[PDB]
């Protein structure tokens, strides 16, 4: 009975035959990443991934995709974080992100680790996902900056955080977006992303072509006239940036 594709604004999609009630429910449903090639294929209920196995979208006939399964028993499920649990599988990487970025020492002095591109990509490419626990703006804005190194606003109601000890990739590597450092001249942006495992989160997307082994940076976008409400290191850099202008 034919096949539906639902594209999110970020370029990922859900694809499959819908059931009698018109739900994306079945054994042969897939989520396809924004490369229109990497896919998680298997059992979904009402568009929610129950058992998605890593696959490649090879071709499409009369609108109907063909998937070849990748080796391994890489399987994924919808596993939205809570305020305390960042993931059921903190050490299981996202397979699309794995092929595109890695973590290494930042090239920015005294900035710890940073996120780097594995491959040359063009503009508008989703590179990495910023998943974390979900907490409130009230909580975040009421606590010390020391606790807010990794907080990223998701929307008016929710802030995503990667709190200790999940700021170390030895404890958490299911996503890596929290490892991109700040620049006032960035090559990437944060953008909304609907992820079949993490749910509604943000991703890191290039705004220009990037080379292999280039460090990926984003503007953190703190309020410069709430001086700035920002960590001291950012305040130093903001002064330098305005000076160059």
């Amino acid at each position: 009975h034919g096949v539906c594709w639902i594209y999110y604004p970020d370029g990922g999609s859900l694809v499959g035959e819908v059931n009698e009630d018109g739900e994306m429910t079945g054994e042969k449903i897939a989520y396809v990443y924004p490369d229109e090639r990497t896919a998680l294929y298997g059992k979904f209920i009402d568009g929610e991934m129950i058992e998605g196995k890593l696959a490649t979208l090879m071709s499409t006939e009369e609108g109907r995709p063909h998937f070849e399964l990748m080796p391994g028993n890489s399987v994924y499920h919808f596993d939205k974080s809570t305020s305390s649990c960042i993931s059921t599988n903190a050490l299981l990487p996202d397979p699309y992100e794995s092929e595109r970025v890695y973590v290494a020492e930042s090239l920015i002095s005294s900035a710890g680790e940073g996120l780097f591109s594995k491959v040359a990509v063009g503009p508008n490419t989703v590179m990495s996902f910023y998943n974390g626990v979900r907490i409130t703006h009230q909580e975040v804005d009421s606590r010390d900056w020391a606790l807010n190194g990794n907080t990223l606003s998701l929307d008016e109601e929710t802030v995503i955080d990667v709190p200790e000890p999940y700021n170390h990739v030895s404890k958490y590597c299911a996503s890596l977006g929290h490892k991109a450092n700040h620049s006032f001249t960035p090559n990437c942006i944060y953008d909304m992303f609907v992820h079949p495992r993490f749910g509604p989160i943000k991703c890191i997307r290039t705004l220009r072509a990037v080379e292999a082994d280039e460090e990926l940076t984003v503007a953190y976008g703190y309020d410069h006239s709430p001086g700035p409400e920002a960590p001291e290191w950012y305040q130093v850099e903001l002064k330098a940036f305005q000076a160059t202008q």
Binding site: H137, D141, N148, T151, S153, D155, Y190, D223, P226, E229
Partner: peptide
Amino acid sequence: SKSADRK
């Protein structure tokens, strides 16, 4: 406001 990328 103690988080990145607020609208």
